[PDB]
Design a protein around this ligand. Structure first.
Ligand SMILES: Nc1nc2c(ncn2[C@@H]2O[C@H](COP(=O)(O)OP(=O)(O)O)[C@@H](O)[C@H]2O)c(=O)[nH]1
Ligand SMILES: [Mg+2]
Length: 387
């Protein structure tokens, strides 16, 4: 019964919210287990979400098929999709592209799929909507060519399936189009690959602080993001200071217990053999040995907080010196703007190149904040690393 994060993406007036309403409905009349059929009113008039200091407008919805339980996310505004995806309100494990068969792919449709590659969304599949209105069959055929050629150039594939649906007629109970969105949810079931168990990910916990206890005890604290660790297994601290450390954890303890295994998500304290207190910093990470290494230069995709959200006032140029909150620490780096971009306004999303004065353990698809002395001015995700 795996849990999966998906969402509808596409142009405005193309019927993303309708299909989301149809999807939840089609499974609620067809399942006692599936949650309340949500109506267009409460999905379209989406609530307001504030995460990491950024304001969003996101509609969360849950439903489950017989193969997976899903966590669906929809937004009203296009910019909200820019916000959500880059700032991770939906660490999406799949995505449903919505292409209205009347218009076809529009700038956002390309912009959404493009941005899907920037944040590492593994799969995108297509829901050819509004087929209740298109007479011509060979027009529909071509509408599939433009898309499948949009998804092919953005490193996706022919493997991804296009499903002609009607988000309206299925929503209105028409058994011919109700079955159409039914096939979608089976494609959704099989096409999107199974998202890895956060337990089965390789071990990773960011360091939060460090103290001296007993005589030989130098505890490190943090909440495990990835994986689990067995007591006395070698770990690897990763580069707030320039070097790469290596030590064998000798005791893990959560609250009253002193476990031999800490799970992903647990607030845990790790006692270590072979380093002292002055060898560990916030933002350092205790990885499984050799799984991850710390880089210094990378290529990211960042969203800048706008005037209305308390974002930066002056636009910034190359050789911009902010801090980058990679995990539990603010590391200062310098910017180079992409060829063609001379200035970054508030509001603007952009690709970006960054050189850090520090080394930081990082992988692609890692959220980070951009701050002016603690005050966050933006956020983003790693897209490409260099050196
Ligand atoms: N005929 C038809 N109209 C649709 C369909 N899906 C959505 N619409 C229309 O599209 C309009 C906006 O739908 P909505 O889901 O809010 O679009 P989005 O949120 O921008 O993706 C509504 O007035 C619907 O009547 C469909 O499958 N068939
Ligand atoms: Mg919408």
């Amino acid at each position: 019964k795996p849990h999966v994060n998906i969402g509808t993406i596409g142009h405005v007036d193309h019927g993303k919210t309708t299909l989301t309403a149809a999807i939840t409905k089609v499974l609620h009349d067809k399942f006692p287990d599936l949650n309340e059929t949500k109506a267009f009113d409460q999905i379209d008039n989406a609530p307001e979400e504030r995460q990491r200091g950024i304001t969003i407008n996101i509609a969360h919805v849950e439903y489950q098929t017989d193969k997976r339980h899903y966590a669906h996310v929809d937004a009203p505004g296009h910019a909200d999709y820019i916000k959500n995806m880059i700032t991770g309100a939906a660490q999406m494990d799949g995505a449903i592209l919505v292409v209205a068969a009347t218009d076809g792919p529009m700038p956002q449709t390309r912009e959404h799929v493009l941005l899907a590659r920037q944040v590492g969304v593994p799969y995108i599949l297509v829901a050819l909507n509004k087929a209740d209105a298109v007479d011509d069959e060979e027009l529909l055929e071509l509408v599939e060519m433009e898309v499948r050629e949009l998804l092919a150039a953005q490193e996706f594939d022919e493997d991804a399936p296009v499903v002609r649906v009607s988000a309206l007629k299925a929503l209105e109970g028409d058994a011919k189009w109700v079955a159409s969105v039914e096939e979608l949810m089976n494609a959704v079931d099989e096409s999107i690959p199974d998202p890895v168990r956060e337990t089965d990910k390789p071990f990773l916990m960011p360091v939060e602080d460090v103290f001296t206890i007993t005589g030989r005890g130098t505890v490190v604290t943090g909440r495990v993001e990835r994986g689990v660790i067995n007591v006395n297994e070698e770990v690897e601290i990763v580069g707030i200071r320039p070097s790469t450390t290596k030590t064998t954890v000798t005791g893990v303890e959560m609250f009253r217990k002193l476990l031999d295994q800490g799970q992903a998500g647990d607030n845990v304290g790790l006692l270590l053999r072979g380093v002292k207190r002055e060898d560990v910093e916030r933002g350092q990470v205790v990885t499984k040995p050799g799984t991850t290494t710390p880089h210094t230069e990378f290529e990211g995709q960042v969203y800048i907080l706008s005037k209305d959200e308390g974002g930066r006032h002056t636009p910034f140029f190359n050789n911009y010196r902010p801090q980058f909150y990679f995990r539990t620490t603010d590391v200062t780096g310098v910017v180079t703007l992409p060829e063609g971009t001379e200035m970054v306004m508030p509001g603007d999303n952009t690709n970006i190149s960054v050189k850090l004065i520090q080394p930081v353990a990082m992988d692609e698809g890692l959220r980070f904040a951009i701050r002016e002395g603690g005050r966050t001015v933006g956020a983003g995700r790693v897209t490409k690393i260099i050196k």
